[PDB]
Amino acid sequence: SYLIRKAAGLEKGAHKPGREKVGRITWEQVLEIAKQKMPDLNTTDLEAAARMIAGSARSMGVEVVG
Amino acid sequence: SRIGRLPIPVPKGVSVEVAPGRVKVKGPKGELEVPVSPEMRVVVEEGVVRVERPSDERRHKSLHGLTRTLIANAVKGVSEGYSKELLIKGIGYRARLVGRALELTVGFSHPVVVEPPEGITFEVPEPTRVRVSGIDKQKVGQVAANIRAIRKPSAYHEKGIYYAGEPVRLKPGK
Amino acid sequence: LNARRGQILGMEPRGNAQVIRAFVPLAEMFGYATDLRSKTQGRGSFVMFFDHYQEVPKQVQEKLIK
Amino acid sequence: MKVRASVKRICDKCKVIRRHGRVYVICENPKHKQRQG
Amino acid sequence: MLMPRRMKYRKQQRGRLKGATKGGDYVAFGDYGLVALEPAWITAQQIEAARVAMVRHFRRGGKIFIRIFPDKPYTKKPLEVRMGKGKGNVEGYVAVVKPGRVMFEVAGVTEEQAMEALRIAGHKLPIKTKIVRRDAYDEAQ
Amino acid sequence: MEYRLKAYYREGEKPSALRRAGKLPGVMYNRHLNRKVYVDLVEFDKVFRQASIHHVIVLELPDGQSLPTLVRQVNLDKRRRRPEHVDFFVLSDEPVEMYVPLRFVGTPAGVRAGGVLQEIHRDILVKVSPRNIPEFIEVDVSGLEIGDSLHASDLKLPPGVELAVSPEETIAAVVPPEDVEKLAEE
Amino acid sequence: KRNVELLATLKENLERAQGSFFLVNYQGLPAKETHALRQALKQNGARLFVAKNTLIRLALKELGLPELDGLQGPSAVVFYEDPVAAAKTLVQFAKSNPKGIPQVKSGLLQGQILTAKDVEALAELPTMDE
RNA sequence: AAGUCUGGGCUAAGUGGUAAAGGAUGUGGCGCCGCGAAGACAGCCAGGAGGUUGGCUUAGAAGCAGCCAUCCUUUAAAGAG
Numbered sequence: 078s079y080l081i082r083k084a085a086g087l088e089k090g091a092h093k094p095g096r097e098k099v100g101r102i103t104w105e106q107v108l109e110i111a112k113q114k115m116p117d118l119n120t121t122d123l124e125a126a127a128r129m130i131a132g133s134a135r136s137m138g139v140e141v142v143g
Numbered sequence: 144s145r146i147g148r149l150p151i152p153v154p155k156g157v158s159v160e161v162a163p164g165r166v167k168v169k170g171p172k173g174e175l176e177v178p179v180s181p182e183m184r185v186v187v188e189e190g191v192v193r194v195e196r197p198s199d200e201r202r203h204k205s206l207h208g209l210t211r212t213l214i215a216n217a218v219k220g221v222s223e224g225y226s227k228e229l230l231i232k233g234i235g236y237r238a239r240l241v242g243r244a245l246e247l248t249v250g251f252s253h254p255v256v257v258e259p260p261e262g263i264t265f266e267v268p269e270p271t272r273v274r275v276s277g278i279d280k281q282k283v284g285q286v287a288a289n290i291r292a293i294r295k296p297s298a299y300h301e302k303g304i305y306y307a308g309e310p311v312r313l314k315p316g317k
Numbered sequence: 318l319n320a321r322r323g324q325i326l327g328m329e330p331r332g333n334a335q336v337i338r339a340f341v342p343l344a345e346m347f348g349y350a351t352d353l354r355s356k357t358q359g360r361g362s363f364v365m366f367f368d369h370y371q372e373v374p375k376q377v378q379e380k381l382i383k
Numbered sequence: 384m385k386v387r388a389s390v391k392r393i394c395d396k397c398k399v400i401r402r403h404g405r406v407y408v409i410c411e412n413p414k415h416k417q418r419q420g
Numbered sequence: 421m422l423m424p425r426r427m428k429y430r431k432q433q434r435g436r437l438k439g440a441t442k443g444g445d446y447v448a449f450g451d452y453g454l455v456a457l458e459p460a461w462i463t464a465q466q467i468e469a470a471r472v473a474m475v476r477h478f479r480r481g482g483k484i485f486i487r488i489f490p491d492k493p494y495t496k497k498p499l500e501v502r503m504g505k506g507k508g509n510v511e512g513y514v515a516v517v518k519p520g521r522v523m524f525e526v527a528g529v530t531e532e533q534a535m536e537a538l539r540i541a542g543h544k545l546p547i548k549t550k551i552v553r554r555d556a557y558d559e560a561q
Numbered sequence: 562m563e564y565r566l567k568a569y570y571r572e573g574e575k576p577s578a579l580r581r582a583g584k585l586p587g588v589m590y591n592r593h594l595n596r597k598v599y600v601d602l603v604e605f606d607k608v609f610r611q612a613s614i615h616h617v618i619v620l621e622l623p624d625g626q627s628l629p630t631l632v633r634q635v636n637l638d639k640r641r642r643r644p645e646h647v648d649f650f651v652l653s654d655e656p657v658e659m660y661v662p663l664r665f666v667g668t669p670a671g672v673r674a675g676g677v678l679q680e681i682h683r684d685i686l687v688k689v690s691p692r693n694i695p696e697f698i699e700v701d702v703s704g705l706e707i708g709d710s711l712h713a714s715d716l717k718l719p720p721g722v723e724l725a726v727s728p729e730e731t732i733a734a735v736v737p738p739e740d741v742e743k744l745a746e747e
Numbered sequence: 748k749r750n751v752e753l754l755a756t757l758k759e760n761l762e763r764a765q766g767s768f769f770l771v772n773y774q775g776l777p778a779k780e781t782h783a784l785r786q787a788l789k790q791n792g793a794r795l796f797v798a799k800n801t802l803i804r805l806a807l808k809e810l811g812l813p814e815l816d817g818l819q820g821p822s823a824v825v826f827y828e829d830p831v832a833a834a835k836t837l838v839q840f841a842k843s844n845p846k847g848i849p850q851v852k853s854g855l856l857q858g859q860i861l862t863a864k865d866v867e868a869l870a871e872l873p874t875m876d877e
Numbered sequence: 878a879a880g881u882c883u884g885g886g887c888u889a890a891g892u893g894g895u896a897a898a899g900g901a902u903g904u905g906g907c908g909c910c911g912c913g914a915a916g917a918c919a920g921c922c923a924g925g926a927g928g929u930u931g932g933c934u935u936a937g938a939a940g941c942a943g944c945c946a947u948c949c950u951u952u953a954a955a956g957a958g
């Protein structure tokens with residue numbers, strides 16, 4: 078989740094995430110972070126390493142388009 | 144969920160003899176007599192001793208578990224025997240036998256001399272380890288307890304008499 | 318330093334050792350000289366220099382006004 | 384020992400025993416030791 | 421705290437605490453209630469003490485219903501005077517409460533949060549109480 | 562959604578006596594009949610805690626009959642908060658006036674803000690046919706903020722069921738919560 | 748009663764989909780060992796065919812209700828059912844015996860195995876890949 | 878003066894034989910549920926995991942200063958604790 082910092086718009090998330098969104102991404106930019114950090118996880122899919130980005134999509138608050 | 148109905152495995156060759164209110168456990172290391180409620184019935188099978196409740200109310204369920212373990216501790220008593228170890232920690236502190244007696248040096252101006260009652264024997268391997276040994280589980284338990292009380296573990300330092308396995312818990316001292 | 322209403326600022330290793338920086342009210346410093354030495358088995362020290370002025374919380378300042 | 388009219392479990396390692404006619408609360412943390420009275 | 425904005429009469433006779441509640445016996449607002457098991461004059465300070473206790477337990481959350489009101493004036497003679505020379509002065513207000521009355525109700529908070537808050541509030545009250553949960557029997561009234 | 566409950570006949574048996582025997586005194590009636598009855602307290606309670614005055618109850622009587630009823634009113638023991646008497650309304654082909662449950666579907670925007678949805682009406686009175694008796698009456702409350710409100714006029718109502726109270730009546734609302742920040746002045 | 752009824756579901760199914768399912772003792776294994784026998788037995792066993800890891804009582808009721816040989820290996824002790832026939836193996840049990848007979852003490856184990864449709868014996872199913 | 882009267886039950890405090898809020902594995906009788914040979918409860922033997930030092934903070938807050946957020950994944954199982 079280092080890579081979802083330079084593909085959102087912020088360097089520091091969104092203060093109080095979940096209610097205010099200050100940057101976002103599509104259903105395929107979720108996959109290019111999946112493309113790099115792939116041996117980084119315990120999975121070997123693409124829509125499994127995208128659900129582990131669409132699940133880190135609310136730590137900083139950078140939501141997803143879908 | 145029940146200590147009393149559990150069967151008491153009697154090793155060969157120790158002999159459990161039954162009587163009104165008592166059972167006699169004779170073995171390789173000695174003999175011990177166990178007081179037993181007349182309400183409880185001790186009964187002797189083959190290589191196994193059992194205990195039965197005349198009823199299912201409190202007083203009897205309570206006496207039940209107790210009685211079987213009382214006998215079982217005597218059984219184990221005369222066969223394998225019982226022992227506790229005491230771990231002396233602390234700089235100045237060290238121990239030794241003086242005859243059958245035990246001499247404790249534990250920071251008092253005077254050294255302390257404990258003398259073993261009948262059936263209890265003291266061993267001092269290392270001068271920081273002491274082994275209280277006997278066939279009566281409760282008497283071994285007591286003597287151990289008495290000795291340790293002479294200088295209970297400090298609450299601020301690893302200093303004093305310790306049970307083997309006793310964890311060393313300490314608070315800061317300012 | 319917390320029990321002196323002091324607000325922390327930093328930790329770094331110097332002579333190693335380990336150096337700290339902090340914001341602390343002049344008031345809660347008297348004989349900190351001697352407290353530190355107890356808190357650190359006499360193995361610690363400090364330097365201390367003036368910074369600024371700021372608000373005293375409401376429930377202390379008024380006692381002075383008699 | 385705390386001695387009081389309302390003895391209570393204070394933490395989850397506290398234990399209510401009852402010895403010799405009195406309600407005690409014993410615990411690994413000494414501060415939690417209670418007698419009722 | 422609580423007291424009538426204005427009264428038709430300033431002091432009133434004492435009366436008696438005979439019998440169960442006239443009404444106020446079922447839950448009619450919240451999810452849980454606190455109900456009196458004994459008769460008493462509940463003082464305004466006792467109510468507000470109970471109230472404040474519950475809000476403080478909720479801290480930002482829940483809703484508190486108060487179903488009794490201290491409309492009864494409490495009189496007490498000036499300290500250390502002898503008997504006579506009229507009825508005393510009004511010194512506070514109380515709510516008359518008989519067994520079965522629902523004094524407080526909470527709503528829109530967890531079961532646990534309601535239970536502890538009602539339990540706590542009950543300790544501020546000079547009588548025994550039981551906590552209740554709104555059931556079908558209540559709604560049918 | 563339809564419940565059955567055993568129910569016996571009584572004449573001059575003291576309600577006190579019956580109440581002791583674990584039985585609940587009661588009566589059944591409509592336009593046409595009136596009978597002094599009694600049911601087992603414990604069984605009735607198990608039934609009533611889901612039926613209420615909403616869902617139907619049929620009384621299997623000691624003669625064979627099985628009349629479908631609604632609970633009209635239940636008398637409580639004020640001191641002990643326990644039931645001491647039931648009125649069972651024997652239903653017929655006629656339309657009937659009754660209380661229909663409200664489901665409050667949705668999570669109010671007012672709630673999301675620390676607010677609290679006060680369900681001012683948990684059921685609603687209604688003219689309906691014993692055959693056309695619903696179960697739910699759903700109400701969207703999600704669009705409500707602090708402090709907004711709904712008024713039974715805002716109810717939908719399935720075909721065959723008529724709002725039996727004044728539409729000016731308030732059903733549910735969202736108010737501010739208890740806050741310790743308020744205690745500052747309290 | 749309970750989700751143990753929804754446990755006879757997946758176990759019957761995934762088993763009645765085989766005939767050569769082995770049984771291992773997926774015990775001791777640490778954190779790395781918890782992804783070792785797991786992902787590597789998908790490097791010689793298709794689908795999620797390493798272990799199913801199920802109640803020994805439940806697998807006993809399966810191989811008994813689905814009549815599949817009634818695998819009377821010794822289903823006592825920690826067991827987890829090495830799926831060789833949800834896979835593509837038989838001598839790719841070499842992949843399991845490998846890291847097993849290497850990593851830590853006793854690593855992964857064996858004690859029973861259905862043989863194609865029959866009964867693979869003791870060290871039999873533990874040498875029918877060595 | 879007249880029963881150490883009969884039958885059923887409870888109480889182990891000398892309660893009976895001087896008191897309240899409140900506290901309690903005291904004892905006994907009820908009751909309604911929950912888990913349980915598809916193996917529950919107790920103890921005990923494994924594991925109890927990765928994306929992730931979860932956003933940013935403090936110089937460190939890395940599951941538990943601490944706020945908001947709080948998913949999925951390899952799973953028998955494992956809460957962004």
Ligand SMILES: [Mg+2]
Nearest residue numbers: 235250251252
């Ligand atoms: Mg000396």
Ligand SMILES: [Mg+2]
Nearest residue numbers: 227284287306
């Ligand atoms: Mg010991």
Ligand SMILES: [Mg+2]
Nearest residue numbers: 387389390391
């Ligand atoms: Mg207290």
Ligand SMILES: [Mg+2]
Nearest residue numbers: 392393394395
């Ligand atoms: Mg607790």
Ligand SMILES: [Mg+2]
Nearest residue numbers: 398409410411
């Ligand atoms: Mg303990």
Ligand SMILES: [Mg+2]
Nearest residue numbers: 433434435436
């Ligand atoms: Mg008067």
Ligand SMILES: [Mg+2]
Nearest residue numbers: 461463494514
């Ligand atoms: Mg008063």
Ligand SMILES: [Mg+2]
Nearest residue numbers: 542543545547
């Ligand atoms: Mg009270």
Ligand SMILES: [Mg+2]
Nearest residue numbers: 442443444561
């Ligand atoms: Mg009315």
Ligand SMILES: [Mg+2]
Nearest residue numbers: 555557642643
């Ligand atoms: Mg009730």
Ligand SMILES: [Mg+2]
Nearest residue numbers: 606642643644
């Ligand atoms: Mg009832």
Ligand SMILES: [Mg+2]
Nearest residue numbers: 880881882883
């Ligand atoms: Mg007699």
Ligand SMILES: [Mg+2]
Nearest residue numbers: 404890891892
């Ligand atoms: Mg006494």
Ligand SMILES: [Mg+2]
Nearest residue numbers: 891892893894
């Ligand atoms: Mg007495």
Ligand SMILES: [Mg+2]
Nearest residue numbers: 890891892894
């Ligand atoms: Mg007395």
Ligand SMILES: [Mg+2]
Nearest residue numbers: 903904905906
């Ligand atoms: Mg009781």
